[PDB]
Amino acid sequence: SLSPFEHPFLSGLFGDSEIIELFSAKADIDAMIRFETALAQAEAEASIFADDEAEAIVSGLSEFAADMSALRHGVAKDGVVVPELIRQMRAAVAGQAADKVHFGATSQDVIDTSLMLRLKMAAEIIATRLGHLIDTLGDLASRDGHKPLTGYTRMQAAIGITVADRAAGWIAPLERHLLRLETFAQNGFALQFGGAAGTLEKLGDNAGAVRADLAKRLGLADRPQWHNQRDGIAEFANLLSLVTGTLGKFGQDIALMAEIGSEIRLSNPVNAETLVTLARFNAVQISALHQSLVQEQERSGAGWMLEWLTLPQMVTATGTSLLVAERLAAQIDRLGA
Amino acid sequence: SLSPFEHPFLSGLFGDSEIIELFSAKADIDAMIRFETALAQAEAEASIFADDEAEAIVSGLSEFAADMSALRHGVAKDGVVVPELIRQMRAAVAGQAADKVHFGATSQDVIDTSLMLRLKMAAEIIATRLGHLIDTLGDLASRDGHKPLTGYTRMQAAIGITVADRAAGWIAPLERHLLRLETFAQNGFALQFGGAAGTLEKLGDNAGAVRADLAKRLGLADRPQWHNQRDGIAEFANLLSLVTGTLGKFGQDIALMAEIGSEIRLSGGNPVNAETLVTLARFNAVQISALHQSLVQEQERSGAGWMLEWLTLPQMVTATGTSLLVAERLAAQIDRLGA
Amino acid sequence: SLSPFEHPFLSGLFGDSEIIELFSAKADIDAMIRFETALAQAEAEASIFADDEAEAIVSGLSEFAADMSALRHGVAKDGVVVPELIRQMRAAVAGQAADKVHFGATSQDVIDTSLMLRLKMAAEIIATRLGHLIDTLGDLASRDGHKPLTGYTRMQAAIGITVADRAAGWIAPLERHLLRLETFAQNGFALQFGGAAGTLEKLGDNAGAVRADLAKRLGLADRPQWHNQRDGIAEFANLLSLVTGTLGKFGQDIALMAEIGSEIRLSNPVNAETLVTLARFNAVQISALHQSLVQEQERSGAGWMLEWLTLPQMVTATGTSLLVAERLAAQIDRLGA
Amino acid sequence: SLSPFEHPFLSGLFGDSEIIELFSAKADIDAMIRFETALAQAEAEASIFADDEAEAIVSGLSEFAADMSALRHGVAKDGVVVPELIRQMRAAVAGQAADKVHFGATSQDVIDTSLMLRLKMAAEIIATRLGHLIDTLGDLASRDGHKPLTGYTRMQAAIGITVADRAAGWIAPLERHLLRLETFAQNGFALQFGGAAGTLEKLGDNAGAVRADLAKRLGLADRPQWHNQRDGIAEFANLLSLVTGTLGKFGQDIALMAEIGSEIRLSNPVNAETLVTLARFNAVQISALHQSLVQEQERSGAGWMLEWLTLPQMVTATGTSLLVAERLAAQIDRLGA
Ligand SMILES: [Cl-]
Ligand SMILES: [Cl-]
Ligand SMILES: [Cl-]
Ligand SMILES: [Cl-]
């Protein structure tokens, strides 16, 4: 396979089946079904169309299973999945209520909202692993923290420090990232709902009320459309790379102590090297999300699709990093003399 | 010169003297002088030495003049300015109080603290310019905001929208970046005071008291040393590129609108200022990668990672600064938006 | 799926099954078998063990199939496939000849050689596609090349030009990249054969002759080991990015001409935008391979795994770009007034 | 100043005045005079205007001093120096002859040719420094090469190697970089001469002849205009980073050996750490030149000006790297146990 994260043998090291499952084609489609179901309900609530048409959409979509091969044919034909997805959804809905699915929405609305739904779940997992890792590393520090370490500054031995002193440079930044992530998670996962040209012209003056209701139903933040405003995507990408960056410092430290040999015992430091790799991977990948801030006019295919290529691997690198760092810390049997 | 920001002619387009002068050798030395002065005062305040010894350091540093040839020679020999700087400062201090300048501090303490003092200054300028530009762009939208525009999605004409619809994509992210900056500036400019191996071993139990007073005197946040913790710098650099990125979207829009030619009127006759915004966006989008690579800063101190930040960050704050200058210039050229 | 290149629906746009199948675990395993097959033969040739010892290896590995799941657990245990892969290869070989597989080799030898064998295959497909695309764009220019076009310099209508004038900016760099790729392919795909610490300490005086024979059998260049010398990889990735870059310039022009709409007929320009995307993708990933030039000591796991993460998608991006560009050119019905 | 390369005290470590003075406003201007002097000579040779007017331009620009302030107002008015520069040049040339300076040329013609003229000079300096350092590292190798070293693979002590073995990983790629540079320098520094939209409209059938003559006179390659074809610039930039990447590998090895301390003597390995810094700097900047490959239409101010911002510092980082490595090499008094 192209990426080691999903590779049938290399995933023994780089694997993260829990985070990767959220970027599966099935998970995307489920979240896209969620968008369309909630949209129909929000539009009934605002009396755009009748209640019995929205319930026909809900029940029609409740047991909706997609034809994957035909969805691929869709993106081969159109460039984007949603017109063929919507076609399949209308085929599942009884009566004239099928003409009402996807009303007022555009392709970017359903794709970006699905992304935000799944990024939200990925961030919950990442925070949980972050808090557990902070505890594990804290246990490494409370076990061996009093023991002397030879300090090292600029590749030379320096004065003696302790294990607690060195550990604080691993743990304290991780605590900051947890807090950064928790603050982000409060309103950073936003509904994408702006219509063909970002103006919601099919909804007129009901635009604001439908948007509010749809956001609440999906558990997402109500914000005006951000079809070309991608600063929250780059902000989340920054955080991802901040976490890998700190864990790569941890990995670089452990590998150096391993090479010196006198001041650790491990149960060769492959996990430590893997942390550095992932740090440097995310530090490269951050550039692509920042290049994608320049998204011209109302919708930019060039800028938008660079995020498709690069973001899922950034959140996987961060999750893998947390797994591998947990595996490394269990290998550490003593720090210090 | 190497950079267009400082170039004798390319600065007609790329220059920002107000921001760039925060990265002058002189401005750096002044901030290092302030560090060493306040360190002396902080240590007398924590009863480490008496008031008259700190006062000998304070008055000696007030009329201290650094020798620049010598300082350059010092970084050739040592890699770092402060040993030679401290050597010179001691010569400006009379008596045995000269032995006490720089007590408890290491070179990364004075270099990073100086950087934070001056990045704080630059952040105040950038915040103010962001605020002004938000208003300017708001005035563009109030003048022509109900006027029709041809929407354009994925390089094809879409349905009609208004000028205020398109302008919200310029204005709204900038308003978020203003708020991001203000939040960062709350406690993000921190004192660097850790000593030789990050443990402030010279001060003992008085390390917390000295650090607290030193941070106060310099107007920086009191936080444990971050010699190898560079997340605040990567976070700050992220915001720098967030601003240029949005402004490059704005510039790209204007340039496309200029090329079509039917729904914009630019004065001066073309869209060089618009292209420049795009260039600067792509510049910082590249440079952000450098500060993220420097997150891996091994052991108690890492020359390799730390010096990458020296090569890259000042031009990132300059690009953000220049972008705000260029965005304001471009907006002043815009006579009409819409039909 | 993390990458739209392999995605069950996004591959309708980004797919390239021919190039992607070169990075499958099966193709890797088959390449690694070839390394170990030809290694035994080269060592028999230099009289290190008997001919029938080598022949038992050749035929035992001819019908070798890997236990993929056990290989996954091998990389979890060891950090790298090869110890496990070798253990299974030994069970497939009859007699005392089983001890002779992998003699004189290290894990990086078999992995980097496998890479090089399959990258040579990828570069062949990419050069064949490049030549064919140059014909196609040449056919566009011999149909419409006489027609006038509005020149555009720095986002402003400039003076008139012709279609041949503009098309030369598409064709000429591609012709240079073809020659570039052809020149690299001469001796740029090299054998990796250095043993534990790069010295081939198992072979003594027979090192030079074994390596030469092994390189010749595999169709690879005989160079001294390059375990920590990754400039040829970065050089190759540069080339990969050079191709997508030019095709991104092509895409950007087509997308711009489509927006204006008066001097092109297509048959909305998703393909033109996709090329711009893949250009900016490869212009980011090139950074990873250059960060990987810093590879410490005799083997750097941190620098080497960054290539694992990033290079397969660079060759796929280049390959997909050529596919998409061939599709985009086939949509162009008219250029000019 | 913004960059340590030029900084009043930081240039103690990062300075390279010989390379940096090739990117001074003066060296730029002098190269643009050279373009314009040779332009008039080439055009009088092809009989586009009289010889007296050609030698009025040559002699007019012999003692040309630029009003620098005015040139800066010129880039604030036009975006580029040349319109104000060409205006100053017609004030230096007597008669009506002054109507002919810049005839048939555009802004990007003189700017990119100036660049090419000075990168050619930078590359000569870099090649010389590279050969000298190959010899210097070779002398370190021939002094201590037989002495035992502890091998380290994947941050762990491996079997014993010798000094000569490890030194080959520093020397052999640099010998390949030297040949790469010599191969590039033969035809890679080209004249830019395309006119307003790449078609040399003012020239007519004299186009090819004037371009051949101008390139000969300036000691650059005759190639067709590459206003929007920046592959030679990304190619050259790749080379620059290959050189710093290898020196960064050398630098990281020395830093690690100093930290262990048992197997070297240095007469605090700051130079070794600086080489890593310069490798990672260039490994980041290579991305900008590859992003600048997408250059839309006949001229792209956006992509072109990103080269302006990033390429001079890439050539300076390579230049400085070779200076720092040569300083580090002289500090090495012993390699080996
Ligand atoms: Cl779409
Ligand atoms: Cl230091
Ligand atoms: Cl290995
Ligand atoms: Cl121009």
Q: How many residues appear in chain D? A: 337
Please state, in angstroms and as integers, the Cα–Cα distance from residue A329 to each residue in A132, A252, A265, A319, D157, following that order. 12, 13, 11, 15, 21
Which chain A residue is nearest to residue C71, measuring alpha carbons? A9
Residue D90 neighbours by CB distance under 10 Å = 15
Residue D332: φ, ψ to 5°: -80, 110
Cβ-based contacts of C259 with chain B (< 8 Å)? 152, 155-157, 256, 260
C270 Cβ under 8 Å from any chain B Cβ: yes
Which stretch of DSSP H or E encloses residue B294?
Answer: none
Closest CA to C80 of C51, C102, C53: C102
Q: How far is the C-alpha of B279 from the C-alpha of B272, rounded, in Å?
A: 10
Residue A68 neighbours by CB distance under 10 Å = 13
User: Do the beta carbons of residue B42 and residue B51 sit within 8 Å?
Assistant: no
Closest CA to D234 of D292, D317, D321, D309: D292
Q: Which of D13, D276, D309 sits opposite B76 (nearest CB)?
A: D13
- Helix, strand, coil % over all residues of chain C, rounded to 5: 65, 5, 30
Amino acid at C103: F
Residue B155 C-beta-side C-alpha neighbours within 13 Å: 24
Name the DSSP class of B49. S
Q: How many residues appear in chain A? A: 337
Residue B268 C-beta-side C-alpha neighbours within 13 Å: 16
Q: Is C199 helix (H, G, I), strand (E, B) or coil?
A: coil
Retrieve residue C88's tokens: 């299974």
Q: What residues form DSSP beta bridges with A152?
A: A157
Closest CA to A151 of D84, B300, C315: B300
| D78-117 residues touching B, CB cutoff 8 A | 78-79, 81
Touching chains, A (3+ CB pairs < 8 A) = B, C, D
Q: Do C259 and B293 touch (CB under 8 A)?
A: no
Q: Is C169 helix (H, G, I), strand (E, B) or coil?
A: helix
Q: Is D45 helix (H, G, I), strand (E, B) or coil?
A: helix
Q: How far is the C-alpha of C171 from the C-alpha of C177, rounded, in Å?
A: 10
Q: How far is CA D48 from the centre of its chain?
A: 34
Helix ranges (DSSP H) in C185-230: 207-218
Q: Is A300 helix (H, G, I), strand (E, B) or coil?
A: coil
Burial class (CB in 10 A: 0-12, 13-18, 19+), A103: middle
Q: Do C196 and D152 touch (CB under 8 A)?
A: no
Q: Which of B152, B155, B289 sits opposite C269 (nearest CB)?
A: B155
Q: How far is the C-alpha of D287 from the C-alpha of C280, rounded, in Å?
A: 9
Report which bound ligand comes closest to the CA of C192: 3
Q: How far is the C-alpha of D164 from the C-alpha of D167, rounded, in Å?
A: 5
Which chain C residue is nearest to residue B255, measuring alpha carbons? C155
Residue A75 neighbours by CB distance under 10 Å = 24
Cβ-based contacts of D281 with chain B (< 8 Å)? 290, 308, 311-312
Residue C23 neighbours by CB distance under 10 Å = 23
Rg value, chain C, Cα: 24
End-to-end CA distance of chain A: 43
CA angle A21, A23, A24 (to 5 degrees): 65
Q: Do A299 and B154 touch (CB under 8 A)?
A: yes
For D220, residues 6+ apart whose C-beta sits below 8 A from its C-beta are D113, D116, D117, D120, D189, D190, D191
Closest CA to B185 of B227, B214, B217, B221: B221
DSSP characters over C290-305: HHTT---TTB-HHHHH
> Domains along chain A?
1-337 (1.20.200.10)
For A276, residues 6+ apart whose C-beta sits below 8 A from its C-beta are A248, A251, A252, A255, B296, C302
User: Do the beta carbons of residue C316 and residue C23 sit within 8 Å?
Assistant: yes
Q: How far is the C-alpha of D89 from the C-alpha of D108, rounded, in Å?
A: 17
Residues D244-277 as b or e (16 or more Cβ within 10 Å = b): bbbbbbbbbbbbbbbbbeebbebeebbbbbbbbb
Cβ-based contacts of C273 with chain B (< 8 Å)? 154-155
Q: Do D155 and C301 touch (CB under 8 A)?
A: yes
CA distance C252 to chain B (A): 10
User: Do the beta carbons of residue C245 and residue C319 sit within 8 Å?
Assistant: no
Residue C285 C-beta-side C-alpha neighbours within 13 Å: 35
Closest CA to B329 of B250, B238, B256, B260: B250
Retrieve residue B129's tokens: 């310019």
Touching chains, C (3+ CB pairs < 8 A) = A, B, D
Torsion C209-C214-C215-C217 (CA) sign: positive
Residue D21 neighbours by CB distance under 10 Å = 12
Torsion B201-B203-B204-B205 (CA) sign: negative
Q: Is B336 helix (H, G, I), strand (E, B) or coil?
A: strand
Residue A156: φ, ψ to 5°: -135, 150
Q: How far is the C-alpha of D328 from the C-alpha of C242, rounded, in Å?
A: 34
Torsion D43-D48-D53-D57 (CA) sign: negative
End-to-end CA distance of chain D: 43
Closest CA to B230 of B282, B302, B281: B302
Amino acid at C303: G
User: Do the beta carbons of residue A107 and residue A193 sit within 8 Å?
Assistant: no
Residue A247 C-beta-side C-alpha neighbours within 13 Å: 36
Q: How far is the C-alpha of C264 from the C-alpha of A257, rounded, in Å?
A: 63
Q: How far is the C-alpha of B35 from the C-alpha of B105, rounded, in Å?
A: 10
Resolution (A): 2.2
Name the DSSP class of D152. E
Q: Which of A11, A285, A305 sits opposite C273 (nearest CB)?
A: A305
Q: How far is the C-alpha of D87 from the C-alpha of D109, rounded, in Å?
A: 16
Closest CA to B223 of A175, C234, D270: A175
Burial class (CB in 10 A: 0-12, 13-18, 19+), A94: exposed
Burial class (CB in 10 A: 0-12, 13-18, 19+), A251: buried
User: Do the beta carbons of residue D161 and residue D58 sit within 8 Å?
Assistant: no
Residues D124-135 as b or e (16 or more Cβ within 10 Å = b): ebbbebbeebbe
Which stretch of DSSP H or E encloses residue D265?
Answer: strand D264-266
Which chain B residue is nearest to residue D12, measuring alpha carbons? B76
Torsion B52-B53-B54-B58 (CA) sign: positive
User: Do the beta carbons of residue B245 and residue B285 sit within 8 Å?
Assistant: yes
| Range C126-132, long-range pairs (CB < 8 A, 24+ positions) | C126/C19, C126/C181, C126/C243, C126/C315, C126/C318, C126/C319, C126/C322, C127/C178, C127/C181, C127/C182, C127/C185, C129/C319, C129/C322, C129/C323, C129/C326, C130/C174, C130/C177, C130/C178, C130/C181, C130/C243, C130/C322, C131/C178, C132/C326
Q: How far is the C-alpha of B54 from the C-alpha of B41, rounded, in Å?
A: 6
User: Do the beta carbons of residue C126 and residue C181 sit within 8 Å?
Assistant: yes
Alpha carbon dihedral B195, B197, B201, B207, in 10-degree steps, equals 50
Please state, in angstroms and as integers, the Cα–Cα distance from residue A188 to each residue in A23, A129, B176, B182, following that order. 19, 20, 12, 18
For B69, residues 6+ apart whose C-beta sits below 8 A from its C-beta are none
Q: How far is CA A323 from the centre of its chain?
A: 16
Closest CA to B286 of D280, D315, C315: D280
Mutate to test the interface with D, among A150, A153, A155 (most CBs of D within 10 A): A155
Q: How far is the C-alpha of C231 from the C-alpha of D249, rounded, in Å?
A: 11
User: Do the beta carbons of residue C80 and residue C107 sit within 8 Å?
Assistant: yes
User: How large is the angle between the packed helices D301-331 and D270-291, nearest 10 degrees?
Assistant: 160
Retrieve residue D278's tokens: 């310069």
User: Do the beta carbons of residue A183 and residue A197 sit within 8 Å?
Assistant: no
Amino acid at B133: L
Residue B43 C-beta-side C-alpha neighbours within 13 Å: 27
User: Do the beta carbons of residue C162 and residue C146 sit within 8 Å?
Assistant: yes
Cβ-based contacts of C201 with chain D (< 8 Å)? 159
User: Do the beta carbons of residue D257 and residue D263 sit within 8 Å?
Assistant: yes
For C20, residues 6+ apart whose C-beta sits below 8 A from its C-beta are A2, C5, C6, C316
DSSP characters over C21-67: TTSSHHHHHHHHHHHHHHHHHHHHHTTSS-HHHHHHHHHHTTT----
Where is chain C broken, named by the residue before each break, C–N > 2.5 Å?
Answer: 267
Torsion region of D115: left, alpha or beta (phi above 0 gives left; psi -120 to 50 gives alpha): alpha
B298 Cβ under 8 Å from any chain C Cβ: no
Closest CA to D256 of A279, C107, A258, C224: A258
Q: How far is the C-alpha of B303 from the C-alpha of D269, rounded, in Å?
A: 9
Residue A198: φ, ψ to 5°: 80, 10
- Helix, strand, coil % over all residues of chain B, rounded to 5: 70, 5, 25
Residue C245 neighbours by CB distance under 10 Å = 31
Q: How far is the C-alpha of A151 from the C-alpha of B279, rounded, in Å?
A: 44
Q: How far is the C-alpha of C147 from the C-alpha of C141, rounded, in Å?
A: 10
User: Do the beta carbons of residue C234 and residue C300 sit within 8 Å?
Assistant: no
Q: Is D76 helix (H, G, I), strand (E, B) or coil?
A: helix
Q: Do C169 and D229 touch (CB under 8 A)?
A: yes
Q: Which residue has the tokens 């920054």?
A: A238
Q: How far is the C-alpha of B82 from the C-alpha of B90, rounded, in Å?
A: 12
Q: How far is the C-alpha of D205 from the C-alpha of D217, rounded, in Å?
A: 20
Q: What residues form DSSP beta bridges with B190?
A: B221
Residue C82 neighbours by CB distance under 10 Å = 24
Burial class (CB in 10 A: 0-12, 13-18, 19+), D73: middle
Q: What residues form DSSP beta bridges with D149?
A: D161
A305 Cβ under 8 Å from any chain B Cβ: no
CA distance A284 to chain D (A): 8
Bridge-based pairing state of the strands B334-337 and A148-153? unpaired
Q: Do D273 and A154 touch (CB under 8 A)?
A: yes
Q: How far is the C-alpha of A12 from the C-alpha of A271, rounded, in Å?
A: 11
Alpha carbon dihedral A290, A294, A300, A305, in 10-degree steps, equals -20
In the structure, ligand 4 is a single-atom ion and the residues with CB under 5 Å from it are D 80, 107
Q: Do C155 and B293 touch (CB under 8 A)?
A: no
